[PDB]
Each structure stands twice: as C-alpha cells, then as structure tokens.
C-alpha cells in the first residue's frame, strides 16, 4: 500500500541540541575577532529573521539568502562588525564540522530507501538545502529533494507536497508523512491523503497530538508503522 516516505523540515532529522550548536558556531565565525557575544547576536538574529521570513508564509517564495543578508546586514551596522558574506555557506561548513543528526537517521533512511521512495521536503532554497544535506551526509539517501524555492511558494502550500508526490509518481494515500510541527510544515493542516507521523522527541507537543495519525519519539518506529500499513 505504502510506496513513499517523506520527511518534512530538518526538525525530523536534526536534533535541537545539534541545531543550536551549528547556530552558535555560525555566529562565532561571523563575528571573528569583533568583540560581540555570539549567544546574544543569535538571539536578535533568530528573532528578526523569523519576523521577516514569516511575512512570506504561504505566499510566492522569496529566497532566504536575500532575507538573511538583509537581517545580517542590519546587525552588522547595529553592532559594527564586518559582514563575512552569505551565512548559508557558513552553515554548510558548520554542519560539516559538527553534524547534529539524530543518532538513528542514517539507519532509518537506509532501511526505508531499499523498500520505498524516501524524499525530503524543506522550506528553504534548493541549492543551500542540498548542500546542507550533503554536509550532513544524507543527501544521497533521499530519492527526491523538494523545496519551497522549487515549488515557488513558502510553507504552507499544496504545490510543495503535490510536487513531492509528482517526483515519486505516487498518490498521497500511498505515502507516509513524517513531520515535527503540523502548523509549520509544508501541507499545514493538509496532506492529500497522506498518513501522518508526528515526531515528538520529548513528548511535550500535546497540542499537536490530536492532529496526526501516529506519534513517535524514535524515528525507527517509522519503519514499523510503514511496514504494518502494508
């Protein structure tokens, strides 16, 4: 019955502890020798980039590289540090150095890939998203990489999922959907017939429990769930 498994957003693959490290080390490289706290610069930057990026939700996609540069450009002015080019390429380097994938990702992707179409969906730019997956070492494990830039709209928008399924050549009813935030993923409260799996690593997402077919704290359960559905 099931022919494709999709992972939406990097929260289903990267841990909060690993993500925060890459982010911390990201600002470290940006500041260099300039006397600024990387912890605080991340706080203001993450706050500002969220504001700017949220204004495009479900609307025609503007690449994040241009929204990041503007946010970073303003911070450089505010605090008086040089802007060392695009942050996107710095992130790929930090992911290379420190990683941050959940311990079982590569194992789970490897098993599913032998039986089903394993695709990933991201609310990011196509080029950088692929480079980031390569840095983590899981790019070649996916049968398809679908992004908001390719679909033309930011999260949420049906064209993203529609295109992901088009790549796999399967209908939604024959696909599984792994996400970590139902109100911040590609399909929003929409799936196209897909069987949803909510990743709650800590069991602290009660508000999202009732809007997901299955719940798991370990991605290896995605193997069993998909297996039983067949």
Residue numbers in the entry: 1 to 230
Wording from the paper:
Following evaluation of >18,000 clones, a BHMeHis1.8 variant emerged containing 23 mutations. More detailed kinetic characterization of BHMeHis1.8 reveals a kcat of 4.5 ± 0.19 min−1, making it 13-fold more active than our previously engineered MBHase BH32.14 (0.35 ± 0.03 min−1) and 2000-fold more active than the original BH32 design (0.13 ± 0.01 h−1). During evolution of BHMeHis1.8, Arg124, which was essential to catalysis in BH32.1413, was replaced by a tryptophan. To gain insights into this mechanism, crystal structures of apo-BHMeHis1.0 and apo-BHMeHis1.8 were solved. Efforts to obtain structures complexed with either substrate(s) or product have thus far been unsuccessful. Comparison of the BHMeHis1.8 and BHMeHis1.0 structures reveals that the 23 mutations installed during evolution cause minimal changes to the overall protein fold (secondary structure root mean square deviation (rmsd) 0.47 Å, Supplementary Fig. 9). The MeHis nucleophile adopts a single conformation in the structures of BHMeHis1.8 and BHMeHis1.0, however a notable 120° rotation of the imidazole ring has occurred. In BHMeHis1.8, MeHis23 is positioned by an adjacent Trp42 residue installed during evolution. Molecular docking of (R)-3 into the apo-BHMeHis1.8 structure reveals a binding mode with the aromatic nitrobenzene ring sandwiched between Trp124 and Phe132 and the polar 1,3-hydroxyketone motif pointing towards a newly introduced Glu26. Interestingly, a PROPKA 331 calculation based on apo-BHMeHis1.8 predicts that Glu26 has an unusually high pKa of 8.1, likely due to its positioning within a hydrophobic environment surrounded by non-polar sidechains. Instead, Glu26 has emerged, which mediates a rate-limiting proton transfer step to deliver an enzyme (BHMeHis1.8) that is more than an order of magnitude more active than our earlier MBHase.
MBH reactions are valuable carbon-carbon bond forming transformations in organic synthesis, for which no natural enzymes are known. Previous work has afforded the MBHase BH32.1413 which promotes catalysis via a histidine nucleophile. In this work, His23 is replaced by Nδ-methylhistidine (MeHis) for the creation of a more efficient MBHase. In this study, we explore the evolutionary trajectory of a BH32 variant with MeHis in place of His23.
